Design an enzyme around this catalytic site. Structure first.
Site, short mmCIF file in Angstrom:
data_model
loop_
_atom_site.label_atom_id
_atom_site.label_comp_id
_atom_site.label_asym_id
_atom_site.label_seq_id
_atom_site.Cartn_x
_atom_site.Cartn_y
_atom_site.Cartn_z
N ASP A 1 -1.50 10.26 -6.02
CA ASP A 1 -1.48 9.85 -4.62
C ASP A 1 -1.70 11.10 -3.78
OD1 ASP A 1 -0.78 7.31 -5.56
OD2 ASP A 1 1.36 7.69 -5.35
N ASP B 1 1.46 -5.94 -7.94
CA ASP B 1 2.76 -5.37 -7.61
C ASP B 1 3.86 -6.36 -8.02
OD1 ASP B 1 1.90 -2.93 -5.85
OD2 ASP B 1 0.73 -4.60 -5.07
#
Length: 251
Positions: free
Chosen positions: A129, A10
């Site tokens: 997702d 990230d």
């Protein structure tokens, strides 16, 4: 295909946002130094997910891709707010092996085909997702916040039809936890697609990776458990090999 172990980095403003316990690194926050390190300790591929503000996101992700590509020799995917063909094309031309699209793919499924036909399906990862809603797995966009009304079972089939090369399947129900990958979700998706499935969300222990692979995942993604050395990549691969999983051992 042999299973892959994937590290997710990230990033924001050109830096890794999560801490690590790798004291042997000069700058654990440099995504190039950290990605090169992971590539040297047995990680098979990298995924970089950027959360830079939109005003600087385009140039920040392009700078990241070029600097990573010149130092690492394993495949990497870049994603996070890639909204159109021009953005995806520029990132691949700058050196990314693959781009991940999610929200933009749901809102314009033909974008999957446009990228796949230009650069090959192998360059296209569709990140999905998903979360249980009212008894069904549903697809969520905008970093897991928007219920699209599209069922996971329909979207997985459509994504393959449109030319995606891989599915990065995150369970919102398990992400951020160390309770285990969502094996129910992985098993559910498995017969609906021939594409590689990357399991994402829930990793905590080595046995969780084994369970994800027995559920049908082709790769398993994790982040903080690797950064903190709660799971060691070499130990994990040895554990998987001992339990009969075909893993990549060209450390």
């Amino acid at each position: 295909l042999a299973k892959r172990i994937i590290a997710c980095l990230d990033v924001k403003d050109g830096r890794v946002v999560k801490p690590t316990n790798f004291e042997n690194l000069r700058d654990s926050g440099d995504p190039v130094e950290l990605g090169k390190f992971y590539s040297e300790i047995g990680i098979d591929e990298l995924v970089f997910l950027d959360i830079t503000a939109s005003v600087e996101k385009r140039k920040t992700m392009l700078e990241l891709v070029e600097k990573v590509a010149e130092q690492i020799d394993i495949p990497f995917t870049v994603g996070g707010g890639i909204h159109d063909f021009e953005t995806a094309s520029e990132l691949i031309l700058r050196g990314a092996d693959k781009v991940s699209i999610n929200t933009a793919a749901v809102e314009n499924p033909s974008l999957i085909t446009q990228i796949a036909q230009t650069f090959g399906s192998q360059a296209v990862v569709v990140a999905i997702d998903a979360k249980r809603v009212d008894g069904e797995f549903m697809v969520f966009t905008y970093s897991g916040k928007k219920n699209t009304g599209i069922l996971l079972r329909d979207w997985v089939v459509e994504v393959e039809k449109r030319g995606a090369g891989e599915i990065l399947l995150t369970s919102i129900d398990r992400d951020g936890t160390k309770s285990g990958y969502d094996t129910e979700m992985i098993r559910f998706v498995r017969p609906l697609t021939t594409l590689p499935i990357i399991a994402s969300g829930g990793a905590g222990k080595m046995e969780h990776f084994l369970e994800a692979f027995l559920a049908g995942a082709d790769a398993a993604l994790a982040a903080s458990v690797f950064h903190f050395r709660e799971i060691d990549v070499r130990e994990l691969k040895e554990y998987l090999k001992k339990h009969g999983v075909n893993v990549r051992l060209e450390l």
